[PDB]
RNA sequence: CCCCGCGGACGCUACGCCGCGACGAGUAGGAGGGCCGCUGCGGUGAGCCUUGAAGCCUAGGGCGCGGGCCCGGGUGGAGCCG
RNA sequence: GAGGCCACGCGCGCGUCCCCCGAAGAGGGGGACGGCGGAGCGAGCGCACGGGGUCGGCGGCGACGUCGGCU
RNA sequence: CCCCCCCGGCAGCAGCACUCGCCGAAUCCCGGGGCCGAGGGAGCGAGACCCGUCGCCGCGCUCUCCCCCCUCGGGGGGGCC
């Protein structure tokens, strides 16, 4: 037996969009490839934002 | 451009091979120098004791600066302070071993977890056996076996430790980067002591196994791994 | 396992080969010296017992 | 090219040479042997013959496969060892020296005492407890399944024939060419035949082993007897 | 400038495939997955079926950790399933 | 001056130290070390304590009696 | 028999006359029994084509020349400044 705690083992985060939008899934494929094969952290941020929900992607006003 | 690119790849491979050869020669000579240092220290202790006895005085050796700590009791019914100190020593399992740099703070922690551990002062042979047979690195939070020197070099080369011999030297003679070298090592997962223990529930000085046995930790290690 | 696998130990520490070779040569020399010294002691005993 | 030389680095322990890198450099004289600078036709042209068939034909060897299976198996990795049985080193127990009396533990010659002659290329022992004594011909046996006793005869300076090899003693079979389905019994030839060559070899070996057996008293009686376990005796307490 | 050879395994349902490391008790309770199961509806299988459906029986052969499922034999006689 | 060890082995020029004569203790002639200086390249066979097992080893037995089927 | 000697000498030496230790950079060699064999495209090279005998690591021989010791070209050694 090992003296560890298992309540925080599974990190709760989006690994994919919960949406079934096929266009969104295609561009998630594109940015998954770009984030994997480039060192640009911008691609990583964009991919994790694509995974997000609508409340986590609020609309941006023109102003 | 085919001949030119062949020349380019041959030159690159040859430069890489020469670099590997130079690094291997450096590793060999560092190990030789470490051997010289070890025998110098071992003979120096004997010589100092001899001159003190010739003069009729007493030579008190330096208090040991390295300890090996083995957790001997299990994980059931442990008080919170003992549990916390064992976690800070990285002994979360029975028959787990860890090298500890000895000072006031570490010794007081060892006193706190005294009933749960057996600790002592390992010798050069014990350090060699532990690192070579059961040495695993914490590389990218993974337990990776130390099967190549490149694994040590990629994680500790910024500190000058680039081989098994450098790691063993830093562990044995407690160097400047002992904390980094020791935390790089995964805690040793030792077997059950072959031949059994005396009594895990009492102290070593009262016929048991817990607490500080001075240099009998080497006997324990030989039976342990 | 190094300490059991010679080439694995040499991969991790190339100086182990020269240490091991020096140890083997030294042990052979010391064994020969002790054997010769014991044989000389036995021959001296034979001479001092059958010196006539 | 030059004549191959001996190793010049004597082995003192397996994997370790007696001399160091610089010592072997000086022994090899690498200081002056320094060097800086300086197929098979796949297709064959054949005259096809016949008028206006062109000149010749460029016929390739190893034509491409006619058929491909629906799926294959990936090739294995590489193991840097695992030599074939013919290249294995053959180990012999120190108690088995030429002329030792052995005890057979398995087979139809179970419990018989035979004479050891030599180890063969496969590590199998060649024995002949002489056929006039206990009906054991020149025959192979396995050193794992024998007991080496302490009694020995000096079978030095006797001539074991050179053709007595593993290929010589290998079993022979008849079945099964020109026959696929068994409606008529192919049980013929099942009577193994002792070859005249085998009889000649047996006579030649025994004619020079027997006088040395008769040289010591009642060893022939010992070889005629078979080994057995009496109810009082135990193999771990027995000196062989 | 490849060519005496015109040739060169598999893969990548990307919701896929592959690698490495650590870990695995569980009531009340929470969550995920279910190519677990029942009934009916929209699609689809140029699906199955009187040369035998459903159901049932079976010392028959198996698959899955499991929920369960497939196939053989018998009975049955008109519907059934992915 | 009648042994052991070295994971020491190309030249040229540069530096550092040591040696000789030193006719200003100038100037040349020699050793040792170098991490210094603009210029491409070793290949060819093997053995293996070498990124997880192979044999390029073998034997016996097989239809109305036996072989295999951990369910 | 015990102690001090004016002082010892020789051999051995934690003894292969089993009195009493701690050890191994001051440590190596060999052998036996048991359990196991997971993985499966490792080729910067020829532009691969018989199934990559491959990488790292440790070695041997040749592209130099003399000899030495056994076999009858083969095997085993000393090197060669
Ligand atoms: Mg567990
Ligand atoms: Mg839990
Ligand atoms: Mg308890
Ligand atoms: Mg036991
Ligand atoms: Mg208690
Ligand atoms: Mg659970
Ligand atoms: Mg001793
Ligand atoms: Mg396998």
UniProtKB/Swiss-Prot annotation, chain A:
Native source species: Homo sapiens (Human)
Compartments (UniProt record): Cytoplasm, Cytosol; Cytoplasm; Rough endoplasmic reticulum
Record's function text: Component of the large ribosomal subunit. The ribosome is a large ribonucleoprotein complex responsible for the synthesis of proteins in the cell.
Disease connection: Diamond-Blackfan anemia 18: A form of Diamond-Blackfan anemia, a congenital non-regenerative hypoplastic anemia that usually presents early in infancy. Diamond-Blackfan anemia is characterized by a moderate to severe macrocytic anemia, erythroblastopenia, and an increased risk of malignancy. 30 to 40% of Diamond-Blackfan anemia patients present with short stature and congenital anomalies, the most frequent being craniofacial (Pierre-Robin syndrome and cleft palate), thumb and urogenital anomalies. DBA18 inheritance is autosomal dominant.
Residues of the whole record sequence present: 2 to 64 of 188
Description of how the protein assembles with itself and partners: Component of the large ribosomal subunit.
Chain's gene name: RPL18
Lineage per the UniProt record: Eukaryota, Metazoa, Chordata, Craniata, Vertebrata
Family: Belongs to the eukaryotic ribosomal protein eL18 family.
Protein name per its UniProtKB record: Large ribosomal subunit protein eL18
From Swiss-Prot, chain B:
Keyword Cytoplasm assigned: yes
Compartments it resides in: Cytoplasm
Single GO MF annotation: structural constituent of ribosome
Residue positions, PTM Phosphotyrosine: 116
Chain positions of Sequence repeats: 8-19, 20-31
Keywords: Acetylation, Cytoplasm, Phosphoprotein, Repeat, Ribonucleoprotein, Ribosomal protein, RNA-binding
Taxonomic superkingdom: Eukaryota
Presence of keyword Ribosomal protein: yes
Record region (4 X 12 AA tandem repeats): 1-31
Modified residues (N6-succinyllysine): 104
InterPro entries for the chain: Ribo_uL30_ferredoxin-like_sf, Ribosomal_uL30, Ribosomal_uL30_CS, Ribosomal_uL30_euk, Ribosomal_uL30_euk_arc, Ribosomal_uL30_ferredoxin-like, Ribosomal_uL30_N_euk
GO cellular-component term (any): ribonucleoprotein complex
One biological process term in Gene Ontology: cytoplasmic translation
Residues modified as N6-acetyllysine: 101
Assembly behavior: Component of the large ribosomal subunit. Homodimer. Interacts with DHX33.
Family matches, as NCBIfam families: uL30_euk
Family of the protein in this entry: Belongs to the universal ribosomal protein uL30 family.
Alphabetized PANTHER family for the sequence: 60S RIBOSOMAL PROTEIN L7, LARGE RIBOSOMAL SUBUNIT PROTEIN UL30
Function: Component of the large ribosomal subunit. The ribosome is a large ribonucleoprotein complex responsible for the synthesis of proteins in the cell. Binds to G-rich structures in 28S rRNA and in mRNAs. Plays a regulatory role in the translation apparatus; inhibits cell-free translation of mRNAs.
Protein name: Large ribosomal subunit protein uL30
Protein's gene: RPL7
UniProtKB/Swiss-Prot annotation, chain C:
Cross-linked sites for Glycyl lysine isopeptide (Lys-Gly) (interchain with G-Cter in SUMO1): 48
Compartments, record wording: Cytoplasm
Entry-annotated residues carrying N6-acetyllysine: 17, 37, 48
Post-translational modification note: Citrullinated by PADI4.
Annotated coiled-coil segments of the chain: none
Cross-link annotation Glycyl lysine isopeptide (Lys-Gly) (interchain with G-Cter in SUMO2), location: 11
Residues bearing the modification Phosphoserine: 49
Assembly information from the UniProt record: Component of the large ribosomal subunit. May bind IPO9 with low affinity. Interacts with RBM3.
Family: Belongs to the universal ribosomal protein uL4 family.
Function description: Component of the large ribosomal subunit. The ribosome is a large ribonucleoprotein complex responsible for the synthesis of proteins in the cell.
Protein name as annotated: Large ribosomal subunit protein uL4
Organism per entry: Homo sapiens (Human)
Originating gene: RPL4
Portion of the full-length sequence here: 317 to 368 of 427
Swiss-Prot record, chain D:
Residues that bear N6-acetyllysine: 191
Highest taxon, organism lineage: Eukaryota
GO biological process: cytoplasmic translation; regulation of DNA-templated transcription; translation
Keyword Protease recorded: no
The entry's keywords: Acetylation, Cytoplasm, Endoplasmic reticulum, Isopeptide bond, Phosphoprotein, Ribonucleoprotein, Ribosomal protein, Ubl conjugation
Cellular localisation: Cytoplasm, Cytosol; Cytoplasm; Rough endoplasmic reticulum
Modified residues (Phosphoserine): 79
GO cellular component terms, semicolon-separated: cytoplasm; cytoplasmic ribonucleoprotein granule; cytosol; cytosolic large ribosomal subunit; cytosolic ribosome; focal adhesion; membrane; nucleus
Modified residues (N6-succinyllysine): 46, 159
Gene Ontology molecular function: any one: DNA binding
The keyword Manganese appears for this protein: no
Entries under SUPFAM superfamilies matching the protein: Translation proteins SH3-like domain
Main location: cytoplasm
Similarity section: Belongs to the eukaryotic ribosomal protein eL6 family.
Subunit architecture: Component of the large ribosomal subunit. May bind IPO9 with low affinity.
Function comment: Component of the large ribosomal subunit. The ribosome is a large ribonucleoprotein complex responsible for the synthesis of proteins in the cell.
Protein name in the entry: Large ribosomal subunit protein eL6
Species: Homo sapiens
